[PDB]
Amino acid sequence: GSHSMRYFYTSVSRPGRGEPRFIAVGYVDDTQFVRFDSDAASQRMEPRAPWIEQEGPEYWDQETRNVKAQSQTDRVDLGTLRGYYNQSEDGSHTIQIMYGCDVGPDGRFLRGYRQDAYDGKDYIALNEDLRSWTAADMAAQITKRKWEAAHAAEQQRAYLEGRCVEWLRRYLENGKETLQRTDPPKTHMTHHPISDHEATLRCWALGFYPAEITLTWQRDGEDQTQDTELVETRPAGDGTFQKWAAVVVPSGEEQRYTCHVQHEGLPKPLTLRWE
Amino acid sequence: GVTQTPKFRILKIGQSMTLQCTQDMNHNYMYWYRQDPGMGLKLIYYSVGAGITDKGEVPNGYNVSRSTTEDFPLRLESAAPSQTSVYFCASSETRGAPYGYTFGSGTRLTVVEDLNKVFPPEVAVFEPSEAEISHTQKATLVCLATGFYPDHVELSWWVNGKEVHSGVCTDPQPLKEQPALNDSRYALSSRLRVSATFWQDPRNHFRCQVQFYGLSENDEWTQDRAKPVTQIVSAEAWGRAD
Amino acid sequence: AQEVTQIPAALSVPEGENLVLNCSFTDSAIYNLQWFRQDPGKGLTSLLLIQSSQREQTSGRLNASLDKSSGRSTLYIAASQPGDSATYLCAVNNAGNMLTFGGGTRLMVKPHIQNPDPAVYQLRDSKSSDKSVCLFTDFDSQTNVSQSKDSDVYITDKCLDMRKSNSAVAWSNKSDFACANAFNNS
């Protein structure tokens, strides 16, 4: 299977309540491995996965320095963007940053990404070719010129195709017993009469890793995606995931419906029918 | 650019002082470094904007504040011998600083056990050797500054009321008069070489000027001898035909 | 962390000769690398600033290179002159450590003495005292002056271009002190 490393930064201004809230989290696939919280007592990058704990003091000192540098950059950028948008000093504002690299099963680079938001809206993003920026408005356009003058795209591309891919490969090897495991979904179907003439069929997938799964309902063989209740894939809290899909069917016509489960851990896609 | 004060200060052990550092360039980033003799600059404290400060490499024994964009004062609450150093303030528009940091001229701090051990230099000019003149048709004057503490002086040569650089070389550093003693007074020599013709003329005037960095006017003094304040001590010699 | 190193810490070279000053750093992820000049008791002068993408910068006789793959920068100085004599500081800027300085290299460009004529001379005080000093002068730049092995006799290091001449000074309050038997040099 193909893998990703992703970092997520949230900065929220707190006017009259001291410094902005800064939260940084690192992921390999759907597993968090590092965190930083400005409001925590440590003021250190902290491990959140067992396999990162074996990184030495130099790693933790480096990631702490660099994450603090990012928090300081965000503190400045909150002030700058407040200026760009002619906003008052008494309102809370949010900067969000996401970046990361994807590698195929062979461990080779597939793609990289860098995206920035202001108050939950696109601000600036690195293009697919990793050579140029797309600015959302005139404010972001001023940023784009500053980033072009710093040759930021060259450095982002260098990171995403170099250190990002190299460290992801290292993490994948060190944590392979969890990160590179394939747990197939434990599947079952429940039946709950709504009335005398209708009933909900719910198709369950439990204890699966990674998070990527397809649950689909068919009526005699035809897909029913537009009449299917499909909850977001959710973490069980033990590192596995859960999902269900439901359809409301006429009573007596239950066996005309099939739930289809596709997961990497399955050697054969499953077809479930009420028994 | 960046203005830091003072240029120089002698502190007794336990005395407090504040180093001022100002810039009117609206720079978010301001820095304090110290430099020991024959070493590089070491970051003490930095600020990424008004109302935040963060420890550098060597923050121990110092405090800073950034109430405003303009000012980044460095505080010593209790002077210790280890804080004898040269202190450089700096600023930058961005962290990346593509133009490089804007640096202040620096502050030389000397911490002493006893202010009564501060002495200005005595200065003497030694006349060129008759033996040199006859052998080379050249004439070397020697300036000797002696008995000064602490060790920071600036020696310059003035010929007929004008500063000279040609034919001048000064000792790279002062020597200790009492090499065993920690609070030893210092000596420094300089040479000014001129033609035998220039020396052997009574109209020509040669002055050795020693700028001494010492106590300030706000320092207390109980001794009979003159307060060893920041002062210029000179000795002058005139050419001779005889 | 960022550790910047400059080995050797001191260099002596004859004037006219080309020289290399070394700089190494442990963290190759940098904004830019800076070479400074520092004269004794003075501040910093920026000579060259190399960007992370740039491989070298040139200003006249100064040329600095950058290799991030080995984490090294060398400053090349062509046709070295006595005026090049100063402390040269290497500094690397990055997000985590900010501008980080090496220990520096003290460069001494030794002037060519065309006609060396090493002699010791006795100089009397210009004021009417009995004080005198000894001057060792006109020795070649290959000659060094050592510390006094007598506490009663003071001897200076060496440093003179009448637009070249080396010199050292000796003095003492001892009455038997003779200028002929004053100096001890290598």
Partner: peptide
């Protein structure tokens, strides 16, 4: 490992 080439907006 974090990205470290930080340019202000």
């Amino acid at each position: 490992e974090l990205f470290s080439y930080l340019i202000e907006k």
